[PDB]
Design a protein around this ligand. Structure first.
Ligand SMILES: [Zn+2]
Length: 222
């Protein structure tokens, strides 16, 4: 089923495009969200074990996505090991902090041994060109192709040294909007400029931000 961000197949309508996508409109624990009022808690520390890897960079008509065929890029939180499957971007950002939208967001998608999904989100402020991302922007496909990459990538560059985060439960932000996703949104912002954000938008065809969804019964832990 075709879905998008404008016209007849836009996010207000994803619920109705298919029975498969129903949770996009009926779900009560949907992402993204506006993080406003939080409960202060004692969150387990994130340990990151990313390394130079071979990755496949994909334009899927909705996002630019960097795929990890092999394991070995992991993140450990509360003594569970989550494997990095792929990361990708939204321009502008999807999640908000006290109403604030950022020029871009990256979502680092992981699974643990029990198939439990975990997304780590970096938010990018307006600032200087991102050097560490240039490697991806240079090979970024501008149609539904894939670049197999005798170019490696080290994703550890894309994460800050300060790994303080917000924690909540939620969903995929694209159909079928599956719930049961753990969300960890890092408090420390990276940077991009307008020319990188506009280049992403050219490639992907549109702005790919789903509107914020109500928290309902969920608490955000900071
Ligand atoms: Zn995403």
């Amino acid at each position: 089923t075709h879905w998008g961000y404008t016209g007849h197949d836009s996010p207000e309508s994803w619920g109705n495009l298919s029975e498969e996508f129903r949770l996009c409109s009926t779900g009560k624990n949907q992402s993204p969200v506006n993080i406003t009022e939080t409960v202060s808690g004692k969150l387990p520390a994130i340990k990151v074990n990313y390394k130079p890897s071979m990755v496949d960079v994909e334009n899927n008509g909705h996002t630019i996505q960097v795929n990890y065929p092999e394991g070995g890029n992991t993140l450990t939180v509360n003594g569970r090991t989550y494997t990095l499957k792929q990361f990708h971007f939204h321009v502008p950002s999807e999640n908000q902090i006290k109403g604030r939208t950022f020029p871009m967001e990256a979502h680092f998608v992981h699974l643990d041994e029990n198939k439990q999904p975990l997304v780590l989100a970096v938010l990018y402020e307006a600032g200087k060109t991102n050097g560490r991302l240039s490697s991806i922007w240079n090979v970024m496909p501008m149609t539904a192709g894939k670049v197999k990459l005798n170019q490696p990538f080290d994703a550890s560059t894309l994460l800050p040294k300060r790994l303080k985060y917000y924690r909540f439960a939620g969903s995929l932000t694209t159909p079928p909007c599956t719930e049961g996703v753990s969300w960890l949104v890092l408090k420390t912002y990276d940077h991009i400029d307008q020319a990188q954000a506009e280049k992403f938008t050219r490639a992907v065809g549109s702005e790919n931000n789903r509107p914020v969804q109500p928290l309902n019964a969920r608490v955000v832990i900071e």
